């Protein structure tokens, strides 16, 4: 937690310790900022020549980096994964709340589990069930009959609408809204008529959602986020989207209604995905991808024309917009020859 | 809960089947069980009727022969679906009565049947019309006015001097009336331009979640009647949007854009400012709207996905398209 001996840490990390196991480790730090008591890690062998500069008490590395160590070393197979683990062990991140704040407004019919914390000025509606060890940050709203599973945590100012289901060990950052009305309207002769959105959102276990993201409820059936999904900030997940287990959605992705995404996918930042279609398992879309069509085969998919100096881009834009006339001039030339 | 005959009458539907069937809610065709009414638009689902467990199905005269249950025959099933879903709506209200934890300034004016959620904050000079509902944790800034029948969900922020019309609905996380992005440049330093215009939202405007509508610089940002705006949109200062226009999710509008009536702006489109889009324009998803649009119709931009290997080539050839033009022309000169 606060401090740990190097040998004990190495044991917990299943790492091979080279150096003094009695060394007291107080936290993790970058290579450039590490000082005495800090452990850091190295993945890229280029950093080998910079270990002399690094002031950490210990460095996590592979067997081949060992002859270059300028400190006690923890030898493992995957330094990056080990870093995730040790950073969890030495985490300084506070909790969103501790105990039940006096200023929280909690309906009488709400069911609270053991060791639930609710932050100041949070609002819990009727019929709400909070599992054991749930933590609700300051100023959150949890709407009627919603369920939040054991160990799940909401940071400050998260809004959960009504009839939402959140599994266990989920984490939601501030500003996020789960279960707002989907964008459902019928067009009556130019006027928009609201379609009540009476489906729900079902979020699985171990789901991590970023800040200022919106996940709309379904129109009739549900919006569903499978287990182990990670979603970054500023994402829009429209009504009745289904996201398969372990899929990653980077920042600012816009998904339209009724999109189904498979398992183990990776959707790159600011991609825009068409609705009423499917993306199979193990697909990667790169940043700013314009996902117009279904994707039935796994692999990496991309779109977009990268930056050019303004003067150059003007020409490119003007020529591409005129590409049908270039395609015409070529067919005629091909005829001549 | 409602009798099928009574529901059919409110829907202006021709009832074919038992008027005494009790309807408890709406459901999808595939999820529908006894007590549920569902609907059908696409004729391809006709075959699916034989496995549907709904007590009643909303359909058209042409679909009626294929029906395996009580049927409500109408001219427009999707629209009827919207109406029946409204009748059978189970959505709660953002608040009921005035919460003791709500902080309401003494000079705030409340009409009849106003409800304000827990920990909401109502500033001085605010006017809330009849039947207005303010959800939990909302802020409504100084001298702002919200018209009869309008509703804000939890954690909506309305700045000062904002006008919202009647029967509006705004989802959580949305911010209306923040400062527009106004700065003057003084030798590389940005000097703030105070934004003292307002936002005027008309009647029956529906705004999604985490949407930002900036106040005007001097004149106002204006959202016309019956406009629908989805989530994550950015509406910059002095944007004017015409009546009945639809703005899909994640659209970015720049300052002083003027949009006409009955437009459809597709998701993640990016629209240049200080220009006009005329009535009845459709911009499809991810549209790069750089230039004024003076004629009605459907407009588009963008090159869709390709396998990464293919894209790499495509992208490189496009960035070198000017050379590809020169060589096409010299080859014409030659022959």
């Amino acid at each position: 937690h606060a401090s740990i001996r190097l040998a004990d840490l190495a044991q917990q990390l299943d790492a091979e310790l080279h150096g003094d196991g009695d060394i007291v480790i107080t936290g993790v730090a970058s290579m450039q900022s590490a000082q005495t008591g800090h452990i850091t890690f190295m993945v890229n062998p280029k950093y080998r020549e910079h270990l002399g500069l690094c002031q950490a008490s210990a460095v996590v590395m592979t067997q081949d980096d060992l002859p270059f160590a300028k400190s006690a070393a923890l030898v493992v197979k995957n330094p990056y994964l080990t870093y995730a683990r040790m950073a969890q062990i030495l985490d300084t991140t506070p909790q969103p709340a501790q105990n039940i704040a006096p200023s929280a407004v909690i309906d009488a019919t709400a069911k609270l589990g053991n060791n639930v914390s609710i932050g100041a000025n949070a609002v819990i509606e009727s019929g709400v069930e909070l599992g054991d060890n749930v933590i609700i940050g300051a100023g959150c709203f949890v709407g009627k009959n919603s369920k939040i599973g054991a160990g799940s945590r909401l940071w400050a100012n998260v809004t959960i609408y009504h009839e939402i289901q959140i599994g266990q060990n989920c984490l939601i950052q501030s500003g996020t809204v789960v279960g707002a009305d989907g964008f459902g309207y019928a067009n009556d002769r130019g006027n928009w008529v609201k379609i009540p959105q009476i489906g729900r959102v079902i979020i699985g276990d171990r789901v991590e959602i970023g800040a200022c993201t919106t996940i709309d409820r379904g129109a009739l059936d549900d919006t569903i986020i499978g287990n182990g999904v990670i979603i970054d900030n500023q994402c829009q997940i429209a009504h009745n989207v289904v996201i398969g287990d372990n899929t990653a959605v980077a920042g600012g992705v816009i998904m339209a209604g009724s999109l189904k995404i498979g398992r183990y996918c990776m959707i790159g930042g600011a991609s825009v995905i068409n609705g009423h279609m499917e993306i199979c398992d193990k697909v990667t879309v790169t940043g700013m991808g314009m996902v117009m069509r279904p994707i039935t085969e796994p692999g990496v998919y991309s779109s977009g024309i990268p930056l050019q100096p303004n003067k150059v881009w003007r020409k490119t834009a003007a020529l591409v917009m005129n590409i049908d006339d270039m395609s015409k001039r070529l067919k005629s030339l091909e005829r001549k020859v | 809960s409602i009798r099928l005959a009574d529901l059919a009458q409110q829907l202006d539907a021709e009832l074919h089947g038992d008027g005494d069937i009790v309807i408890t809610g709406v459901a999808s065709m595939q999820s529908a069980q006894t007590g549920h009414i569902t609907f059908m638009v696409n004729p391809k689902y006709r075959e699916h009727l034989g496995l549907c467990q709904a007590s009643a199905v909303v359909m058209t005269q042409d679909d009626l022969p294929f029906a395996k249950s009580a049927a409500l025959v109408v001219k427009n099933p999707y629209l009827t679906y919207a109406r029946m879903a409204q009748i059978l709506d189970t959505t709660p209200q953002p608040a009921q009565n005035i919460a003791p934890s709500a902080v309401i300034d003494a000079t705030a004016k409340l009409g009849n049947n106003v409800s304000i959620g827990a920990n909401a904050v109502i500033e001085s000079g605010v006017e809330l019309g009849d039947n207005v509902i303010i959800g939990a944790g909302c802020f409504v800034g100084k001298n702002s006015k919200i018209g009869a029948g309008s509703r804000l969900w939890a954690n909506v922020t309305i700045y000062h001097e904002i006008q919202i019309g009647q029967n509006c609905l705004i989802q959580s996380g949305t911010v209306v009336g923040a400062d527009g992005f106004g700065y003057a440049n003084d030798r590389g330093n940005w000097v703030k331009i105070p934004q003292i215009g307002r936002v005027i939202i008309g009647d029956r405007v529906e705004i999604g979640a985490c949407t930002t509508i900036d106040r005007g610089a001097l004149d106002d940002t204006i959202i016309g009647n019956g406009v629908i705006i989805d989530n994550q949109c950015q509406i910059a200062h002095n944007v004017v949007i015409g009546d009945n226009t639809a703005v899909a999710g994640g659209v970015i509008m720049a300052g002083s854009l003027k949009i006409g009536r009955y437009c459809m702006i597709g998701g993640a489109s990016v629209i240049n400012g200080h220009m006009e889009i005329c009535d009845k324009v459709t911009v499809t998803g991810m549209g790069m709207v750089m230039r004024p649009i003076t004629e009605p119709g459907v407009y588009s931009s963008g090159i869709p996905l390709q396998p990464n290997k293919v894209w790499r080539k495509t992208a490189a050839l496009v960035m070198n398209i000017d050379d590809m033009s020169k060589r096409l022309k010299s080859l014409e000169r030659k022959v």
Binding site: N310, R314, K315, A317, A318, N322 | M290, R291
Partner: peptide, 10 residues
């Protein structure tokens, strides 16, 4: 505009 003069030369 940004594309007008290029297009004119064309």
């Amino acid at each position: 505009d940004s594309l007008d003069t290029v297009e004119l030369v064309m």
